[PDB]
Amino acid sequence: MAATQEEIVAGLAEIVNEIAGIPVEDVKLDKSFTDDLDVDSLSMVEVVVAAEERFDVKIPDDDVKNLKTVGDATKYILDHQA
């Protein structure tokens, strides 16, 4: 189902908090997954893929490691959302 930036960000934030610990309000399209989120390529792909499918979007598993920011993910999720 189609969710916009803040909607999907909330669901994304909630889930990255499971991986590392960026506050739900701190989750922005400007903070880097690898840097700010302090997440690992595997780590991000694990629970953040669990985050993609929960809104019903389609992105390749490994592709989450390609996005260096949480926001880069979101916009890609926002482009490829169903």
Token readout for 12 is: 């994304």
Domain boundaries, the chain: 1-82
Between CA 80 and CA 18 the distance in angstroms is 24
Token readout for 30 is: 């400007």
CATH H-level superfamily of 1-82: ACP-like (1.10.1200.10)
Structural contact between residues 46 and 70, judged by C-beta atoms closer than 8 angstroms: no
Between CA 76 and CA 49 the distance in angstroms is 13
In terms of C-beta distances under 8 Å and separation of at least 24 residues, what long-range contacts does 23-30 make, across chains too?
A: 27/70, 28/70, 28/71, 29/5, 29/69, 29/70, 29/71, 29/72, 29/74, 29/75, 30/69, 30/71
What phi and psi values does residue 69 have, to the nearest 5 degrees?
-125, 155
- Catalytically active residues are 40
Between CA 73 and CA 12 the distance in angstroms is 9
Question: In angstroms, how far apart are the furthest CA atoms of the chain?
Answer: 30
